[PDB]
Amino acid sequence: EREKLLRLEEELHKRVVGQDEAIRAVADAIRRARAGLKDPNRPIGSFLFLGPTGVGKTELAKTLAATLFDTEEAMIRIDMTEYMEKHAVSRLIGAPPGYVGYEEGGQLTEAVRRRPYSVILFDAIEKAHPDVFNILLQILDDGRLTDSHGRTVDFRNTVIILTSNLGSPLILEGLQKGWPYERIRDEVFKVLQQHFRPEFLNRLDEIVVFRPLTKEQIRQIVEIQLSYLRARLAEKRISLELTEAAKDFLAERGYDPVFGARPLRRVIQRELETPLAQKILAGEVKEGDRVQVDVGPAGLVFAVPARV
Ligand SMILES: Nc1ncnc2c1ncn2[C@@H]1O[C@H](COP(=O)(O)OP(=O)(O)O)[C@@H](O)[C@H]1O
């Protein structure tokens, strides 16, 4: 186990590209919980994830779940977009009876109740009703939260990861030489205190900051994401060898500055998977080929080597 903990950044980067500054902070925070220098009555981790969207917030969250608890299923997501009113609370903990399916339970509690070794992701944390924070704050004090039926749900074995892009438009400046390692984590801290109570922020083990990806990185994701496709082709002994520009073509169409790498997968679907099929069906690509994918003025181009 100690081998996993000391090496924690390697095991994480296996799926998460760059963000070393982000990755180090969570791996140091986790090393602190284990080894025993924390309050035991607190979740294994609480982190504020700040940065743009599409740049890996969730990836890390899934990865952290996969590497820390043996699976990406070990991660409960709650979107704070759908919890913005008085009727918010009653979903998270399931606060009837009488009121609809309380006999079902509350989804935060119930999820944590059935799967206590998990990673809980709250997105858009700013959107939540100020009433929701009290609930989340007690979860960080005692590490324990009583549901509506008087079942106390035990969060002490979890990792809580909140996301927001409140600090983003003032992190796109840091990016430009000006501000280096810290100073962004710190100047952004001032904008958070303008939205969040300090009783909440000082429970958070860390506010981690997530820089945008650069065309050399997008490229690296571009590769990882073919994996399934590549695997699936392999069964037919087909290889899929790309070209530098071809990679760049993907990224270009696949990376919205405000929606990060979110689009790319479908992009790959539309620009690469689609035409590929025609050819495979049309017999342009036979079983057992080295496909040479590349760019053109009407999009990607596929060629095969003169057999032999
Ligand atoms: N650092 C990263 N490492 C690997 N893949 C990434 C990274 N950042 C983004 N991606 C890719 O982008 C897609 C969505 O990323 P995601 O974490 O959902 O972004 P966000 O949550 O910020 O919108 C994933 O399918 C993933 O493959």
68: number of Cβ within 10 Å: 23
Tell me how many domains the chain contains: 2
Residue 228 and residue 191 share a domain: no
Residue 204 and residue 232 share a domain: no
Backbone angles phi, psi at 301, to 5 degrees: -130, 140
CA–CA separation, 76 vs 118, rounded Å?
Answer: 7
| Assigned token pair, 186 | 């710190």
CATH code, 299: 1.10.8.60
> What is the separation, in whole angstroms, between the first and last Cα of the chain?
51
By what method was this entry solved? X-ray
Q: Report how far ligand 1's centroid is from the alpha carbon of 213 (Å).
A: 10
Domain boundary among 192, 212, 232: 212
Residue 219 and residue 196 share a domain: no
Q: Which atom of ligand 1 is nearest to the CA of 261?
A: 12
Report the helix count and the strand count for the chain, using DSSP H and E: 14, 10
Residue 151 and residue 131 share a domain: yes
| Assigned token pair, 240 | 């899929």
Query: Among 149, 33, 50, 55, which Cα is nearest to 101's?
Result: 149
CATH code, 135: 3.40.50.300
Residue 136 and residue 24 share a domain: yes
- Bridge partners, 154 (sequence order): 144
- To test ligand 1's pocket by mutation, which of 11, 59, 163 has the most ligand atoms within 8 angstroms of CB? 59
Residue 206 and residue 221 share a domain: no
Residue 218 and residue 207 share a domain: no
Query: What's the reported resolution, in angstroms, to a tenth?
Result: 3.0
Residue 171 and residue 48 share a domain: yes
Which domain does 250 fall in, by range?
213-308
Task: Look up tokens 């858009």; give the residue.
Answer: 124
Domain boundary among 191, 212, 233: 212
Residue 241 and residue 116 share a domain: no
Q: Report how far ligand 1's centroid is from the alpha carbon of 123 (Å).
A: 14
Exposure pattern of 101-133 as b/e (b: 16+ CB <10 Å)? ebeebbbbbbbbbebeebbbbbbbbebbbeebe
Helix H or strand E encompassing 294: strand 290-294
Domain boundary among 160, 182, 212: 212
DSSP-assigned states of every residue in 123-151: ESGGGS-HHHHHHHHHHHHTSEEE-TTSP
Helix (H, G, I), strand (E, B) or coil at 203: coil
